[PDB]
Amino acid sequence: FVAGVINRERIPTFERMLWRVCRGNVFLRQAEIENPLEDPVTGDYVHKSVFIIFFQGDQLKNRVKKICEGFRASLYPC
Amino acid sequence: TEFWLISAPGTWEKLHAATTKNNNLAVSSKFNIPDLKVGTLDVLVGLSDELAKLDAFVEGVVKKVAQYMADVLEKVQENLLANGVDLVTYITRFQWDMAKYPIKQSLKNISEIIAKGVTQIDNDLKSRASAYNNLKGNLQNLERKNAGSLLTR
Amino acid sequence: KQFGPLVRWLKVNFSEAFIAWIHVKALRVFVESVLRYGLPVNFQAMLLQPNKKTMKKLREVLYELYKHLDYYPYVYYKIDC
Amino acid sequence: ADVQKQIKHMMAFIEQEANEKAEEIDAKAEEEFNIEKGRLVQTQRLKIMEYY
C-alpha cells in the first residue's frame, strides 16, 4: 500500500504510465485537493491531487516506487 | 526474413480465423501452446524480467553459432530444426513437455532448466571452437613460413 | 578432422538452441498475457506469421482491433533471426 | 468500462493466491502426518524393546 500526492497537471499521464508498466492493475483513486499548497522549491503554489496504491501484492511496490519518483510524487504513510 | 508473433486473448479463436481473412498480410498459423503451471502473481512479475534477460542471451549466443559456421567451410542457410526448416518448425512446434516438464514450475524450474541447458552449450561451444580456430591460424603460419624471400622463408 | 566434428557439434547445438529459444519466447508469451488480458482460468492463446514490406498496414490493422479490445496496446514479442 | 474488467482480473488473482497456499498446506498436512507417526512409533518401539 502506498498513499501519496501528485499535481493535477501530471495526473493523466501518470495513470497512463501506471497502467503500462504495472500492467496487472492498481485500482487508482482520483481526487483533487482544494486551494493551492506549496512545497518550497517544487512546486510553488500549485493545487495537487491524492492517489491510492493498495494493490495487495507486495511485489509491484518496487515497480510503482520508480514511477512515483519519475513523476516526482510526494508520498506519506497512512 | 522476419518473424511476427502476436497473441490476441479476451468463439474468439474463430476471430483468429477472421484474421486469416486478411490474406494480403499474412497466413497467421496457430502454434498451439500447452497449459503451463501457474499460481503465483509475485513470482510471475519477477519472471517477466528474467524471461527478458534470458531471451536476449539465448538468441545472442545463437547468433555467434552462425558466425562460427562460416569458419568451417565459408551463406548457406541449412539450420534444420528437428528435420525441418525454421519456418515449417515454428508454424507447428510446441513445448516438448519432457525437455521442459509441464508438471514442474514454469517460473523457476522450467526456466532455469532451459537457462542452464543453453548456457552449457554456450560455454562449451565457445571453448571448443577456440581450439579449432587455434589450429587453423597456425596452419596459415605454416603457409606464411613457406612464403617470402629465402632469407626469411 | 576437427571440421567434421565441429560441424556435427554445431548442428547439435544450434538446432537445440533455436528450439529452446522458441520455447523461451513461448514462456515469455505465457507470461504477461495472463496479466494484460484477464485470467479466469487461462487466456485465448493464438499466434501469427511473418510479413514482408506490408507491416505498416499490418500494424494499422492490428491496432484497429486492439484499441477497442484494451510498445503496443496488445501483447507482442519480436523474434527475428 | 475497462476498469470493471481489471477488477475481476485482480479478484481472480487474489482468490487464486488464497487457493494455492491452501494446497501447499494441504500437502503439508499429509507430508508431515505420515512421518510424524513413524517417529513416535520408533521411540515407543525403543521404549517397548528395552522393557522387553
From Swiss-Prot, chain C:
Segments forming a coiled coil:
none
User: Where in the cell does this protein reside?
Assistant: Cytoplasmic vesicle, Secretory vesicle, Synaptic vesicle membrane; Cytoplasmic vesicle, Clathrin-coated vesicle membrane
Protein name stated in the entry: V-type proton ATPase subunit C 1
* The family this protein is said to belong to: Belongs to the V-ATPase C subunit family.
The free-text function statement in the UniProt record for this protein reads: Subunit of the V1 complex of vacuolar(H+)-ATPase (V-ATPase), a multisubunit enzyme composed of a peripheral complex (V1) that hydrolyzes ATP and a membrane integral complex (V0) that translocates protons. V-ATPase is responsible for acidifying and maintaining the pH of intracellular compartments and in some cell types, is targeted to the plasma membrane, where it is responsible for acidifying the extracellular environment. Subunit C is necessary for the assembly of the catalytic sector of the enzyme and is likely to have a specific function in its catalytic activity.
Q: Which organism encodes this protein?
A: Bos taurus
Q: Which residues of the full protein are shown?
A: 274 to 376 of 382
> What binding partners and quaternary form does the record give?
V-ATPase is a heteromultimeric enzyme made up of two complexes: the ATP-hydrolytic V1 complex and the proton translocation V0 complex. The V1 complex consists of three catalytic AB heterodimers that form a heterohexamer, three peripheral stalks each consisting of EG heterodimers, one central rotor including subunits D and F, and the regulatory subunits C and H. The proton translocation complex V0 consists of the proton transport subunit a, a ring of proteolipid subunits c9c'', rotary subunit d, subunits e and f, and the accessory subunits ATP6AP1/Ac45 and ATP6AP2/PRR.
Q: Which domain of life is it from?
A: Eukaryota
Known tissue expression: Expressed in brain (at protein level).
Swiss-Prot record, chain D:
Give this protein's Gene Ontology molecular function annotations: proton-transporting ATPase activity, rotational mechanism
- The modified positions for Phosphotyrosine read Y51
Q: Where in the cell is it found?
A: Apical cell membrane; Cytoplasmic vesicle, Secretory vesicle, Synaptic vesicle membrane; Cytoplasmic vesicle, Clathrin-coated vesicle membrane
**A single Gene Ontology CC term:** vacuolar proton-transporting V-type ATPase, V1 domain
Presence of keyword Phosphoprotein: yes
Tissue expression, as annotated, is: Expressed in brain (at protein level).
Q: Which GO terms describe its biological process?
A: pH reduction; proton transmembrane transport
Record keywords: Acetylation, Cell membrane, Cytoplasmic vesicle, Hydrogen ion transport, Ion transport, Membrane, Phosphoprotein, Synapse, Transport
Q: What family is this?
A: Belongs to the V-ATPase E subunit family.
Q: How does it assemble?
A: V-ATPase is a heteromultimeric enzyme made up of two complexes: the ATP-hydrolytic V1 complex and the proton translocation V0 complex. The V1 complex consists of three catalytic AB heterodimers that form a heterohexamer, three peripheral stalks each consisting of EG heterodimers, one central rotor including subunits D and F, and the regulatory subunits C and H. The proton translocation complex V0 consists of the proton transport subunit a, a ring of proteolipid subunits c9c'', rotary subunit d, subunits e and f, and the accessory subunits ATP6AP1/Ac45 and ATP6AP2/PRR.
Role according to the record: Subunit of the V1 complex of vacuolar(H+)-ATPase (V-ATPase), a multisubunit enzyme composed of a peripheral complex (V1) that hydrolyzes ATP and a membrane integral complex (V0) that translocates protons. V-ATPase is responsible for acidifying and maintaining the pH of intracellular compartments and in some cell types, is targeted to the plasma membrane, where it is responsible for acidifying the extracellular environment.
Could you tell me what this protein is called? Answer: V-type proton ATPase subunit E 1
Organism of origin: Bos taurus
**Name of encoding gene:** ATP6V1E1
